[PDB]
């Protein structure tokens, strides 16, 4: 008897920690320690998917004496309208109602075209440069920040101002840095709302300003803009890096994709499913029980914390035969959980899929000799950031 303690060690730079796969083999749910509260850890696909659709399991904390959180986690929960369990139903419903129509089929088709041209240009710049090159700086970082500039209607150079703010806001190791970074985001967004009130364009804040004959306050609109800025590029950057690394590890699949770029949607779904970095603390969706819930033989009690391991569930052999293998020829794969499921299902997921498809349609056809310029083991996953990620990806080609 030894209580498992999150985060678990992972001897590889990607994948699922061995201890978490061991727990998955024993059963769907286990009690574990963490750096803070103890929590229920749910690791099997069926149970994670069921619990993500359970309205009794919510982001907000219902407890009278709530455990202390990092500034970074507090900001993340507040951006997601989860900071007050009594107002979360109305506030979260409004948040999704206001953001979902900002990603319309008209907008996504226009952005798909612009994204494809931008990838072409980014890869031409890359191909013309002298290796070794940092792929993270010149490709992974550049496409999703371009997209956020487009969503917000700001000059592309603005991403040189805001490009580190998601990392800084979500730095769990430094509350002062987290809070100072978030104030920069807030000031920038309030400036942007005031500009869009007199100079609107085809962009998200302009649409929110016009919503309900201007019924929303500038603070309400800036709040939603802050969610788009802080959630809308960093995780996509991380998936471009993880997808590149996964494809570099699987040369037979990589050659399949280079030969037939029509395999890119299937590759993107495998990248999302398998793309887990380091100790994988970002591949856990946190919840609190607002009512008692039974999982198998186990009772989750009102007030308990729950970690839904979407990463482990996406590796679950019960849901994906040979679940640890990258295979873009899977026939009718189950829907992975990398965008979540249920009430808080990723709002940007169709846009994120368009970005990743445009990149991986092109990458290995444009740079067939691309490969790491350093050992994989030298790549360092940043455990202190809620969103993890690598800081650099040196390549040659
Ligand atoms: C590959 C990139 C991405 C991944 C892997 C990802 C993953 C996720 C996951 C797992 C959730 C659910 C969190 C939870 O249930 O607690 C989520 C929510 C969310 N995502 Fe994404 N995301 C990505 C890209 C984006 C983009 C590009 C946008 C917008 C431009 C975006 C906007 C949001 C928002 C606003 C939420 C909160 C939804 C809610 O709380 O109702 N995400 N994302
Ligand atoms: C809103 C989020 C940025 C989406 C989710 C994906 C993430 C990631 O891939 O890094 C974030 C990690 O931390 C979380 O609590 C998550 C898992 O819900 C995320 C919050």
From Swiss-Prot:
Q: Which UniProt keywords apply?
A: Antibiotic biosynthesis, Heme, Iron, Metal-binding, Monooxygenase, Oxidoreductase
| Reactions listed under catalytic activity | pentalenolactone F + 2 reduced [2Fe-2S]-[ferredoxin] + O2 + 2 H(+) = pentalenolactone + 2 oxidized [2Fe-2S]-[ferredoxin] + 2 H2O
* InterPro entries in alphabetical order: Cyt_P450 (IPR001128), Cyt_P450_B (IPR002397), Cyt_P450_CS (IPR017972), Cyt_P450_sf (IPR036396), PentlenlactSyn (IPR054976)
Q: In which pathway does it act?
A: Antibiotic biosynthesis; pentalenolactone biosynthesis
E.C. no = 1.14.19.8
Per the record, the coiled-coil ranges are: none
Protein name as catalogued: Pentalenolactone synthase
Supply the source organism for this entry.
Streptomyces arenae
What gene is this protein translated from? pntM
């Amino acid at each position: 008897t030894d209580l498992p303690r999150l985060p678990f060690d992972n001897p590889d730079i990607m994948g699922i920690a061995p201890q978490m796969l061991a727990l998955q083999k024993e059963g769907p749910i286990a009690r574990v320690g963490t750096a803070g509260e103890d929590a229920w850890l749910v690791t099997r696909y069926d149970e994670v998917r069921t619990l993500l659709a359970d309205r009794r399991l919510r982001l907000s904390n219902p407890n009278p004496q709530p455990s202390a959180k990092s500034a970074a986690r507090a900001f993340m929960v507040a951006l997601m309208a989860g900071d007050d369990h009594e107002t979360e139903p109305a506030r979260h419903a409004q948040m999704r109602s206001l953001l979902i129509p900002r990603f319309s089929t008209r907008r996504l088709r226009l952005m798909k075209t612009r994204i494809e041209h931008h990838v072409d240009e980014l890869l031409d710049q890359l191909a013309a440069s002298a290796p070794p090159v940092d792929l993270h700086r010149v490709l992974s970082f550049r496409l999703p920040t371009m997209v956020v500039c487009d969503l917000l209607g700001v000059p592309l150079a603005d991403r040189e101002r805001f490009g580190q703010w998601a990392r800084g806001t979500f730095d769990q190791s430094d509350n002062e840095h987290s809070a100072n970074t978030f104030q920069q985001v807030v000031d920038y967004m309030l400036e942007l709302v005031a500009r869009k009130r007199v100079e609107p364009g085809d962009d998200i804040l302009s649409e929110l300003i016009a919503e309900k004959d201007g019924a929303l306050s500038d603070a309400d609109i800036a709040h939603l803009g802050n969610a788009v800025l802080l959630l809308g590029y960093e995780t996509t950057i991380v998936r471009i890096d993880l997808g590149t690394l996964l494809l570099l590890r699987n040369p037979v699949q990589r050659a399949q994709l280079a030969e037939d770029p029509g395999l890119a949607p299937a590759a993107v779904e495998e990248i999302l499913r398998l793309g887990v970095g380091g100790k994988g603390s970002n591949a856990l969706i946190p919840r609190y029980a607002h009512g008692d819930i039974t999982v198998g033989e186990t009772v989750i009690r009102t007030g308990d914390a729950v970690m839904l391991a979407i990463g482990a569930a996406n590796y679950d052999d019960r849901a994906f035969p040979d679940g640890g293998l990258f295979d873009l020829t899977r026939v009718r794969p189950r829907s992975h959980l990398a965008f979540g499921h249920g009430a808080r299902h990723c709002i940007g997921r169709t846009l994120a899929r368009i970005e990743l498809t445009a990149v991986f349609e092109r990458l290995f056809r444009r740079l067939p000799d691309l490969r790491l310029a350093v050992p994989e083991e030298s790549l360092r996953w940043q455990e202190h950031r809620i969103t993890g990620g690598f800081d650099e990806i040196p390549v040659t080609f």
